[PDB]
Amino acid sequence: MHNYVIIDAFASVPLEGNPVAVFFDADDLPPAQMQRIAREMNLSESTFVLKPRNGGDALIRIFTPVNELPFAGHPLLGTAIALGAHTDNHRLYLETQMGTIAFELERQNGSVIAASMDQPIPTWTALGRDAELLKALGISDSTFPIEIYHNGPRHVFVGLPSIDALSALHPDHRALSNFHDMAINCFAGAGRRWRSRMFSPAYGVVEDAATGSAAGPLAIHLARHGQIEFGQPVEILQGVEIGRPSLMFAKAEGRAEQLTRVEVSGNGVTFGRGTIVL
Amino acid sequence: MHNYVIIDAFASVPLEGNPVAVFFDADDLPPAQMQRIAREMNLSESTFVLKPRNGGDALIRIFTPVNELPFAGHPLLGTAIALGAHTDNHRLYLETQMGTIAFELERQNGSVIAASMDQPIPTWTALGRDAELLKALGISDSTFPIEIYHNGPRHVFVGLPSIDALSALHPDHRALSNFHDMAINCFAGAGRRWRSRMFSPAYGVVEDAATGSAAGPLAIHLARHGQIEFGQPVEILQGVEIGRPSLMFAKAEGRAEQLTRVEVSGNGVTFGRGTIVL
């Protein structure tokens, strides 16, 4: 009854990046059933491709094993790459709970290998729990201001003075569980090239492979704090320490006070394909 | 490159019971790759069907997303039901790290709908942390002695005076995380019919749908404590509260001091089928 594909998002090699299951022709599935299927698959998200209701190409609903999400970066990227297999269009308009997200698809010989999305514009403020967070992470201080960004999920950024220092982190995950409804993103790098690790008890992941919705906020954080310019693309490599390398590209256009576009792009690859019995 | 099926073990209806992914013809996969695939699928277990090395029908390796397991009940039951689709034999001998487990397959029109296994004979002793465990569970006392059983995994049993009391449990999962390398199985019932809930921070599950390896130990616990006889089959219904009903049948033959057979059986159903790219 339903076809699905498993896409590793932010990777070009299977078993790298972050998997999402994408279910096609889902209009006959009530959302209670979509939630049960997402629970059954147990991937960080499963998405469901529905007929559009506002002039887009398709309406996408995104579910973790436990709840529906209004926005998620890696699941949406994977969905666009999956759906790109059944269309010839250059651009793909995906309706979500939060509006229609424009995707540019990149192909080779009819195969979609990558896509770029324009993300919701985040907001941000100081976290204001620095000593607590630093203690939990096991370090004394951040490099750049510890700020928390909101674009659906919330992501806090803590900067490390080198990639080695980033890899040496061994956080107190019990201590981190006191930070509700957010993910902790630790980063290090220079110039165009940055490394990240994400930890989130609130979002049910000890350490995440590819935090798509943190990539845009990171490019903003770096530009605001003078490490790159607004409009300069950055490469963010995540998940190396846990053996799930994920490459996210991001760019924040405009200025802090008036952001014009937050672009995030990356590769996607098919890990598997199947059908389910309902 | 590899075919797989998703079997809901201890269920006859898709989305009930406990899913396992079973990968066929896995001899060309090194165990490091099997572990990576199990991580990718993220189901409580994935299993891999290999050529036998000691006169069995097949050698099965069982992986959680994080490690290999020497024995697991629901994954093995699901594997036997999956593999039963590619043989006509009445009995199926599955080699595992811990020896060859004999499965009787039950068919209708060539479809395997159920199977029975003879489990490893458990051992047991008092847990000796009663007040700590009871506090964590949020109740004052158990009905029957709080004993911990070992058959690979470890399972502790805490008895409740009614099914309603079992459903009313709201455990302190942080407090439960102090119980390492075990699962906490709470039960209630009468006669042939029992209800269970399982919680296990050590094994990475907040509440489990079908704890196959606890079913045999529960039948022993009940017979030792005079609620059923040795040799009497019990029906154990798990996972009702979390909307994943799982029906496990168990029987412990012999006597406490000399157990002859610990039989656990149940239904299995295919939820999905697919192929992966490596």
Closest residue to B19, CB basis, from A19, A40, A278: A40
Q: Cα separation of A44 and A181, whole Å?
A: 16
**Which residues are paired to B2 by β-bridges?**
B276
Are A9 and A84 found together in one domain?
yes
**Cβ contacts (< 8 Å) between A8 and chain B: which residues?**
40
CB B18 within 8 A of CB B209: yes
Q: Where are the beta strands (DSSP E) in B137-242?
A: 147-150, 154-159, 183-190, 193-200, 205-208, 234-238
Which method was used?
A: X-ray
DSSP A121: P
CB B105 within 8 A of CB B71: no
CB B264 within 8 A of CB B250: yes
CB A108 within 8 A of CB A81: no
Closest residue to B276, CB basis, from A36, A243, A272: A272
Q: Cα separation of B175 and A25, whole Å?
A: 44
Are A204 and A66 found together in one domain?
no
Give me the residue label for tokens 């099997």: B34
Which stretches of B48-195 are DSSP H helices? 73-83, 130-137, 163-167, 173-176
Which A positions 161-190 lie with beta carbon below 8 A of chain B?
Answer: 174
Interface mutation vs chain B, best among A3, A41, A111, A176, most B CBs within 10 Å: A41
Q: What residues have CB less than 8 Å from B129, skipping those under 6 apart?
A: B179
Whether residues B273 and A275 touch (CB distance < 8 A) is answered with yes
Q: Cα separation of B86 and B59, whole Å?
A: 15
CB A53 within 8 A of CB A94: no
CB B114 within 8 A of CB B268: yes
Give me the residue label for tokens 């006070």: A257
Question: Which residue range is the domain that position B198 belongs to?
Answer: 120-267
Q: Cα separation of B54 and B51, whole Å?
A: 10
- The number of domains in chain B is 2
DSSP B12: S
Whether residues A275 and B278 touch (CB distance < 8 A) is answered with no
**Which residues are paired to A123 by β-bridges?**
A150
Give phi and psi for A85, each to the nearest 5: -65, -20
CB B274 within 8 A of CB B17: no
What DSSP assignment string belongs to B80-111?
Answer: HHHHGGG---SEEEEEETTEEEEEEEEEETTE
Structure token pair of residue A151? 């674009």
Collapse the DSSP code of A264 into the 3-class scheme (helix H, G, I; strand E, B; otherwise coil) and give the result.
strand
Q: Cα separation of B272 and A213, whole Å?
A: 30
Give me the residue label for tokens 């606890």: B214
Chain A residue with Cα closest to B43: A42
Q: Where are the beta strands (DSSP E) in A64-200?
A: 68-69, 91-96, 99-108, 111-118, 123-126, 147-150, 154-159, 183-190, 193-200
Strands B234-238 and B46-50: unpaired
Are B99 and B33 found together in one domain?
yes
CB B188 within 8 A of CB B159: yes
Give me the residue label for tokens 């005079």: B226
Structure token pair of residue A199? 């930890």
Q: What residues have CB less than 8 Å from A118, skipping those under 6 apart?
A: A101, A102, A261, A262, A263
Closest residue to B277, CB basis, from A14, A40, A42: A14
Which B positions 257-276 lie with beta carbon below 8 A of chain A?
Answer: 270-276
Instruction: Give yes or no for A4 touching B (CB within 8 A).
Output: yes
Are B27 and B111 found together in one domain?
yes
Are B111 and B179 found together in one domain?
no
Whether residues B19 and A37 touch (CB distance < 8 A) is answered with no
Are B124 and B101 found together in one domain?
no
Give me the residue label for tokens 């990240």: A196
Are A99 and A144 found together in one domain?
no
State how far residue B107 is from chain A, nearest Cα, in angstroms.
19
First to last CA, chain B: 5
Strands A183-190 and A154-159: parallel
Are A147 and A229 found together in one domain?
yes
Given the residues B16, B40, B45, B235, the one annotated as active site: B45
CB B68 within 8 A of CB B62: yes
Are B124 and B259 found together in one domain?
yes
Are B167 and B58 found together in one domain?
no
Strands B2-9 and B258-276: antiparallel
Buried b (16+ CB within 10 A) or exposed e, B268-277: bbbbbbbebe
CB A22 within 8 A of CB A45: no
First to last CA, chain A: 5
What DSSP assignment string belongs to A201-242?
Answer: TTTTEEEES--HHHHHHHHHHHHHTTSS-TT--EEEEE-TTT
Whether residues B15 and A40 touch (CB distance < 8 A) is answered with yes
Instruction: Give yes or no for B256 touching A (CB within 8 A).
Output: no
Are A136 and A108 found together in one domain?
no
Task: Output helix, strand, coil percentages for chain B, rounded to the nearest 5.
Answer: 20, 45, 35
Classify residue B131 as left (phi > 0), alpha (psi -120 to 50) or beta: alpha
**Cβ contacts (< 8 Å) between A271 and chain B: which residues?**
40, 276-277
CATH number at residue A131: 3.10.310.10
**What does R_g of chain A's alpha carbons equal in angstroms?**
18
Are A98 and A165 found together in one domain?
no
